Design a binder for this molecule. Structure first.
Ligand SMILES: [Ba+2]
Ligand SMILES: [Ba+2]
Ligand SMILES: [Ba+2]
Ligand code: NA
Lengths: 93, 93, 93, 93
């Protein structure tokens, strides 16, 4: 609850930083910058967007190392502390 | 057993929702929509398909956050509660 | 030791099946088929190769669900039961 | 602390080896080689770079199996032993 709340905020700030960085340095539209940040940090990585500048490539290296751990923590506690009880609620006779 | 069964169903419904969404909004053939949903939620992400619309990009962001946890849970219990015993069965003299 | 050995074999057989499938149905060279199988099951997924046939797409869906759990188990026990001691060996004065 | 330090070094050496390999055999610029090594071992895998030679494909197979476990260990202890306390520090009244 309080755990999920902090992880939510931390993940939001991370995605805001990526949105700002890639829309400025890589010239993406803000929605595309957000989408790319998510596709990156979840490791999906389609490659429909990818950094073309060296600044973008260096940021991306650092962004991945700092952000993957946080994003997957959130995905994990979301599944565990929000998704897991709710599915059991739908179960019990 | 009962665990694996619930995870199977939950994963199926998730993949059905993606199949329906991407065949409608992104105009994919249903098989391609299913395939893309799987390639997305397992994080493989080839990028042979990727959303071209903003609606598609926003759904994909949400779809990834909600679905990755469920899919990998299923992959995990499938390996643990179905794959792991079966391989030991083939072992014991 | 015996754990790592079984996981090695199981991973090899999985990669052999992918090598055979993608070289036949998708017409890849055997080395490219192996490479693609690995890039797929580790979720790296560059997309330099991806299935173009519906048979290939359906197999890939199943191949991912069955194979990811096994591959990452191997990667895990390789790191834990082979990589982790060896690095400590290089450490102790 | 001492754990994080060893994982840092091990990850650095891994990324140096990839930087050297892909700039030589695949002809990438060193920054692109580093970037590609990171995008590979974190499994993001955009595919903006991917190996074109058989030597490159075989190395990549081995590089992924050896390196993913190490990289994610580092990402994990970085989040746990460096990121997790620091965020709590910002919390306590
Ligand atoms: Ba990927
Ligand atoms: Ba890709
Ligand atoms: Ba791609
Ligand atoms: Na991944």
């Amino acid at each position: 609850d309080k755990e999920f709340q902090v992880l939510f905020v931390l993940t939001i700030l991370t995605l805001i930083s990526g949105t700002i960085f890639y829309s400025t340095v890589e010239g993406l539209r803000p929605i595309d910058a957000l989408y790319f940040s998510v596709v990156t940090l979840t490791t999906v990585g389609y490659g429909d967007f990818s950094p073309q500048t060296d600044f973008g490539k260096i940021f991306t290296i650092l962004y991945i190392f700092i952000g993957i751990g946080l994003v997957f923590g959130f995905i994990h506690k979301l599944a565990v502390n929000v998704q897991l009880p709710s599915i059991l609620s739908n179960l019990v006779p």
